[PDB]
Design a protein around this ligand. Structure first.
Ligand SMILES: [Ca+2]
Length: 117
């Protein structure tokens, strides 16, 4: 699941190792998140956290992961083979991967001290 998100990001940013580059960035990229996002990238992570929060409230997710997707020519496509929960999470992941590829990356915000969140 994390493995798929990591792959989606690499589809959009081929030079990155996402679990290293994007983990522990700002107040929202990484486990949990609170306070105000520090920049646009952190705002991508906040939306992504809110998309997963939304997912946990859908009737279909109740029993809910591991969805199917493809990367081709640097474009991500979620598969129609995905059941409702899986399709919703593939869309949260795809939107965040795209979001990350479109905003600046600030080294000053990597491993930010949470006292700032
Ligand atoms: Ca988070």
């Amino acid at each position: 699941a994390l493995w798929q998100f990591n792959g989606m990001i690499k589809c959009k940013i081929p030079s990155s190792e996402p679990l290293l580059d994007f983990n522990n960035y700002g107040c929202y990229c990484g486990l949990g998140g609170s306070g105000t996002p520090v920049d646009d990238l952190d705002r991508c992570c906040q939306t992504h956290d809110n998309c997963y929060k939304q997912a946990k409230k859908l009737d279909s997710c109740k029993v809910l992961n591991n969805y199917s997707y493809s990367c081709s020519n640097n474009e991500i496509t979620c598969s129609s083979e995905n059941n409702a929960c899986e399709a919703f999470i593939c869309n949260c992941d795809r939107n965040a991967a795209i979001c990350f590829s479109k905003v600046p990356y600030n080294k000053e915000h990597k491993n930010l001290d949470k006292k700032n969140c």
